[PDB]
Amino acid sequence: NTTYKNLQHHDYSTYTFLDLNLDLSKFRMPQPSSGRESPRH
Amino acid sequence: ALFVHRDTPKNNPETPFDFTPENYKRIEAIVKNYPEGHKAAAVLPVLDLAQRQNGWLPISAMNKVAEILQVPPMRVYEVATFYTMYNRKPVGKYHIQVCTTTPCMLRNSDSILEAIQKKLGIKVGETTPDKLFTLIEVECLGACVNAPMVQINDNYYEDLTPKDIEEIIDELKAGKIPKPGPRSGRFSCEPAGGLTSLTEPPKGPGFGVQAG
Amino acid sequence: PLMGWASTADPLSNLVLTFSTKEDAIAFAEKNGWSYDVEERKVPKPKSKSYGANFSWNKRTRVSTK
Amino acid sequence: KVDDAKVSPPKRAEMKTSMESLIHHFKLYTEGYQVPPGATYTAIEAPKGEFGVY
Amino acid sequence: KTSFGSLKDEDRIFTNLYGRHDWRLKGAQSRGDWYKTKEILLKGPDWILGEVKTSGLRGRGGAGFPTGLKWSFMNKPSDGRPKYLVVNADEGEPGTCKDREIIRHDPHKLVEGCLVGGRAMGARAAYIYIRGEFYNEASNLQVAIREAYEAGLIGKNACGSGYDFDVFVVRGAGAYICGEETALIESIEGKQGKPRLKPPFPADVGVFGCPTTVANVETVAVSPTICRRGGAWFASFGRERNSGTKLFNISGHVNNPCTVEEEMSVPLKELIEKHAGGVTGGWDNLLAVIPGGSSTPLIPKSVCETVLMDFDALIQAQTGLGTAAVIVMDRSTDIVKAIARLIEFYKHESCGQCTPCREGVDWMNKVMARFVRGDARPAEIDSLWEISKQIEGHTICALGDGAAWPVQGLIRHFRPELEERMQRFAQQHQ
Amino acid sequence: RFRGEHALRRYPSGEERCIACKLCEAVCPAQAITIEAEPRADGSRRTTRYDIDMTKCIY
Amino acid sequence: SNLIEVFVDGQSVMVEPGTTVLQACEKVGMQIPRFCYHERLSVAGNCRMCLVEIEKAPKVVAACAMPVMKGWNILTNSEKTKKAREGVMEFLLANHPLDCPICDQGGECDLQDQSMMFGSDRSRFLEGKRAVEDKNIGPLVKTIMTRCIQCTRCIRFASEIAGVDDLGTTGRGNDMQVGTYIEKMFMSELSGNIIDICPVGALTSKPYAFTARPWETRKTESIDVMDAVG
Ligand SMILES: Cc1cc2nc3c(=O)[nH]c(=O)nc-3n(C[C@H](O)[C@H](O)[C@H](O)COP(=O)(O)O)c2cc1C
Ligand code: SF4
Ligand code: SF4
Numbered sequence A: 001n002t003t004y005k006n007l008q009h010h011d012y013s014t015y016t017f018l019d020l021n022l023d024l025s026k027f028r029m030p031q032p033s034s035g036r037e038s039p040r041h
Numbered sequence B: 001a002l003f004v005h006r007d008t009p010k011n012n013p014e015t016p017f018d019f020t021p022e023n024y025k026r027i028e029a030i031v032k033n034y035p036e037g038h039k040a041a042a043v044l045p046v047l048d049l050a051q052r053q054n055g056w057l058p059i060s061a062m063n064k065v066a067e068i069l070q071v072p073p074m075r076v077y078e079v080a081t082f083y084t085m086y087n088r089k090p091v092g093k094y095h096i097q098v099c100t101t102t103p104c105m106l107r108n109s110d111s112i113l114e115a116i117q118k119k120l121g122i123k124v125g126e127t128t129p130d131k132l133f134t135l136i137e138v139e140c141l142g143a144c145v146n147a148p149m150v151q152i153n154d155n156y157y158e159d160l161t162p163k164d165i166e167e168i169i170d171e172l173k174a175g176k177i178p179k180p181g182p183r184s185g186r187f188s189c190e191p192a193g194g195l196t197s198l199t200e201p202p203k204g205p206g207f208g209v210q211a212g
Numbered sequence C: 001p002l003m004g005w006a007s008t009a010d011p012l013s014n015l016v017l018t019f020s021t022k023e024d025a026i027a028f029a030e031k032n033g034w035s036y037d038v039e040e041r042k043v044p045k046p047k048s049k050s051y052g053a054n055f056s057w058n059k060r061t062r063v064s065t066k
Numbered sequence D: 001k002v003d004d005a006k007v008s009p010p011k012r013a014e015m016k017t018s019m020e021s022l023i024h025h026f027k028l029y030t031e032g033y034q035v036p037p038g039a040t041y042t043a044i045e046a047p048k049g050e051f052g053v054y
Numbered sequence E: 001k002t003s004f005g006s007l008k009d010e011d012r013i014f015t016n017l018y019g020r021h022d023w024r025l026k027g028a029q030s031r032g033d034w035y036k037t038k039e040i041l042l043k044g045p046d047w048i049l050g051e052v053k054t055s056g057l058r059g060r061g062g063a064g065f066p067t068g069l070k071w072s073f074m075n076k077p078s079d080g081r082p083k084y085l086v087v088n089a090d091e092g093e094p095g096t097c098k099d100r101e102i103i104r105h106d107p108h109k110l111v112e113g114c115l116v117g118g119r120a121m122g123a124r125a126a127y128i129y130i131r132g133e134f135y136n137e138a139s140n141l142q143v144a145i146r147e148a149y150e151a152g153l154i155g156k157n158a159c160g161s162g163y164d165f166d167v168f169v170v171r172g173a174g175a176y177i178c179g180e181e182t183a184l185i186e187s188i189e190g191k192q193g194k195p196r197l198k199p200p201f202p203a204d205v206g207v208f209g210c211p212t213t214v215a216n217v218e219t220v221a222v223s224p225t226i227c228r229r230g231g232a233w234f235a236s237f238g239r240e241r242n243s244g245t246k247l248f249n250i251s252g253h254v255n256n257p258c259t260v261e262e263e264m265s266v267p268l269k270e271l272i273e274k275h276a277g278g279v280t281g282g283w284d285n286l287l288a289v290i291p292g293g294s295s296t297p298l299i300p301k302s303v304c305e306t307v308l309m310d311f312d313a314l315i316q317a318q319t320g321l322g323t324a325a326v327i328v329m330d331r332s333t334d335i336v337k338a339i340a341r342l343i344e345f346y347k348h349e350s351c352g353q354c355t356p357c358r359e360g361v362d363w364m365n366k367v368m369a370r371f372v373r374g375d376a377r378p379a380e381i382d383s384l385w386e387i388s389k390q391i392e393g394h395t396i397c398a399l400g401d402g403a404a405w406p407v408q409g410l411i412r413h414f415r416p417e418l419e420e421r422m423q424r425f426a427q428q429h430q
Numbered sequence F: 001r002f003r004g005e006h007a008l009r010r011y012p013s014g015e016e017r018c019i020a021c022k023l024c025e026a027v028c029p030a031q032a033i034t035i036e037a038e039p040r041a042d043g044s045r046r047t048t049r050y051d052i053d054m055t056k057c058i059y
Numbered sequence G: 001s002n003l004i005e006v007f008v009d010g011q012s013v014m015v016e017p018g019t020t021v022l023q024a025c026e027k028v029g030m031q032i033p034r035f036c037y038h039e040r041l042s043v044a045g046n047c048r049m050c051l052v053e054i055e056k057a058p059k060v061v062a063a064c065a066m067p068v069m070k071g072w073n074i075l076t077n078s079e080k081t082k083k084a085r086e087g088v089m090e091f092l093l094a095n096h097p098l099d100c101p102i103c104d105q106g107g108e109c110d111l112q113d114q115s116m117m118f119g120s121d122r123s124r125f126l127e128g129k130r131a132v133e134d135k136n137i138g139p140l141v142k143t144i145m146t147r148c149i150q151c152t153r154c155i156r157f158a159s160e161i162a163g164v165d166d167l168g169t170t171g172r173g174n175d176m177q178v179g180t181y182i183e184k185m186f187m188s189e190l191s192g193n194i195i196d197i198c199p200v201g202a203l204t205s206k207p208y209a210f211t212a213r214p215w216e217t218r219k220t221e222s223i224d225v226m227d228a229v230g
């Protein structure tokens, strides 16, 4: 197929990466902790 | 390129700098992705949020990021002085990156460099006596398969010529922005001959597989 | 008092005798008569360090810089 | 001189523009070059006679 | 065995090169995604590793480490520490656009492949690292992740079975070193991107101390197709060590510089002229050919007219095969100037861990400046040879090595232009 | 190239040529050089006391 | 029972598991020359000086951070070990300025001693020689940052003993300035102990600065005061 199936990329605004990271935050297993909350606590 | 701060106010903390609570919810999504115990890994996305909010980051932005992520600021200063996307000098609206190394310069980037130079006026690496025309030439970006390239704010321009230079710069003066994609036809990264790629509509899951 | 130097009435002030063992040192000092103070040898203590331990997961030994 | 700059000091041109020759000049005149352990003897013909050095 | 190999249609591993029928999970299903993958997943990861080593996947990105050995190191028994999969998507070797095409026109097969890799080795979460130059393509990737989540088929309890698998995306901030094997890992860690030391492997201590691994995007793309298709159907294209299909792209000096899928071997003259327009000015106009990209020595005219495009062939030619900039360059450009600009790029992007790459690229940049201006002696060009023998392999990463190799190729092949340049500088000053 | 007076030099319309880098006292085979060094209020490193013993000087 | 056999040029010796090549080589007396490794800190590898040709390997590897498999043989006095030392020592002295008179580590350098005993003699690299302008770290510690060989020893000392985290690497390639970015006069405890850490003449004492050069002064045993630890 010789037709450009994209231009789905064309509408991308300068906030959309953080928007998708924002909206896809659910089903997040707890990113496992280790002792203190931080290297300096 | 003067990697020591040397305050010069319009810098010199505290410069008044603060975000949006919507951006604070972005911040909480960012340090909710990474696991507990290593909060200090989201420094580069939070600093990316700071750049996308305010076009260049001041030093009070770095103090703000350090107090948000409860880290000493020195790691934020390291990450700010280390990478390329973060310009500690103040810039304009649009930012010009003329990429030219191995296919780009060897496919005659110097015509594009001359066109940008004698169209805009200011020399390479420097800034402009207005906004929206901070010009730097840059090293490779990845998008190599075409003519030497121009990056503006999260957009590309390939397959150039000085009349396209005149058109794109006059239309950024006007404010109407052209497409990120290629030029001279060939609507993607294409073999631009007689379509030597696939032509048939692909079958996929239908034909002979095994252990599936 | 004429040049600003450090004179001394000590001919023995610039002696040093580099030896190889403590036993022959004590034997020579007792052989030649004068008294002596023995300080004992101190090696550097062997340690237990590793780069993977500098990249810990839930141990606090973390490089925090690089 | 020998072309072994870790024993004989270099000359002025390379001394004023090198790096290795300046370092060799500096430490060669402060410390003195190290000499491997052992006892040697030799003797040449002084006009008196056997000038020996041990 | 094939007679040096070429493209036969529908044997393309992935279709939809650019702008084709749609851009959707429905289009992925029409092209061959989400088809009978649960029966592959619920058979056991040992069978997936057997399928991949049946295909015999040579590792991509211009390294040479095969995927089967790496993911067989990834079969550690699971302890209290989880397992991570990191999909690297930077484009170094300037001239690339390797996976720019893939992440711009088909993220769905990448989602398929990261799900396959997460099941096949006990991994639990996959971080996908995109270059910071790619905001719009990153947002296309975010739209595709939203579509795959909105299908309700990845995220938690994938394929209907009780198997959660989350995928995240971390942007780049612009580097060459973040593409490498371990500076990637610490760049995710929030510390500045700097490689670790190798004998503690990433499969033992990785992202903060967990057994992880890093996959190239071409490996992620080819991985569900080998699972859903037959054993060694992929392996029937080319030789025995290297096997399968690869993107050979000319990003550089030809008429219509572009990208083509091909098999593992190809005659180079057919590759250059019978697929991508023609050479600028004819076949006899070019001065030389660089394969690989930028971490590869050059190949001159009398060698490029005969040598086939295999990994073992370029080992026999003392070079290293990479991706997408298998390009020629004209006599009308000075290869000294081109390689000197590449050395300037190497200086502009390199971290400062190791002393030898730092100071060696410093000397080579200043000395290639003195060669473009021609203000040296032939002892200097042999000194550049000696230092390029000194640097190689005495570092952490391969950026110092990939700065050593172009100097090696230039000295092994194009001595006489250097001698004539220096003689013309002698005629100029005298 | 006679060896006589033990004189000093100075820069062209400039300050004292010595730095007090103690090389001459490190090499002086009768140790007749005596250097005690201090920096002044400017910042460049200099001396306090630079003494040649003419008795010990073997030249 | 937890032993490892290595041959140091034929001389067999036993190695505890997990340790380095360098601790065993220092156990048999061979001081492999080092610049970034120091035993009070963690193990970086950024100085590259400790390369040593370990047998049946075409690549010459570091010795400060090598795990010790059973049954090695360690060739310290080979050919290409000396060639790698010549190369590395020639690389260090390129962008290092001619300051050995006005340095304060004339008797106590490390480049000087190890470049006599291990390096080349005829230099190269005719032009070039960039320079990094100094900073103002503290009025107790005089600081010249052109002589910094970027060895990352003061940084590890800060982040692992001082815990202050004010010194960092800035830049890439040749251009790596090491220090504090923000014109802050770094003042903390044990900041006087950084002039003994810095192996080259880049961090010297400010009040001592230019009074002597250490071959004249004689060294004498004594016991500390003002602290109850000594
Ligand atoms: C010098 C160097 C540059 C690299 N550049 C890139 C790059 O731009 N993009 C990328 O995805 N990987 C890059 N890599 C990593 C390789 O692609 C590596 O093979 C990858 O981590 C795993 O690929 P494989 O498992 O298919 O062999 C680079 C590695 C090195 C040593
Ligand atoms: S070779 Fe250079 S770029 Fe690579 S890890 Fe070492 S210092 Fe960094
Ligand atoms: S201290 Fe001696 S060697 Fe050094 S500059 Fe002064 S006179 Fe010359």
Ligand code: SF4
Pocket: G147, G148, G149, G150, G151, G152, G153, G154, G155, G178, G197, G198, G199, G200, G202, G203
């Ligand atoms: S200041 Fe000294 S200790 Fe710190 S990196 Fe530089 S040379 Fe090493």
Ligand code: SF4
Pocket: D023, G096, G097, G098, G099, G100, G103, G104, G105, G106, G109, G110, G111, G112, G147, G199, G200, G201, G202
């Ligand atoms: S630290 Fe540098 S300037 Fe100082 S004595 Fe050593 S080589 Fe010379």
Ligand code: FES
Pocket: B099, B100, B101, B102, B103, B104, B139, B140, B141, B142, B143, B144, B148, B149, E093, E094, E095, E096
């Ligand atoms: S060199 Fe211009 S994009 Fe890679």
Ligand code: FES
Pocket: G033, G034, G035, G036, G037, G044, G045, G046, G047, G048, G049, G050, G062, G063, G064, G065
């Ligand atoms: S001592 Fe091993 S590299 Fe510095």
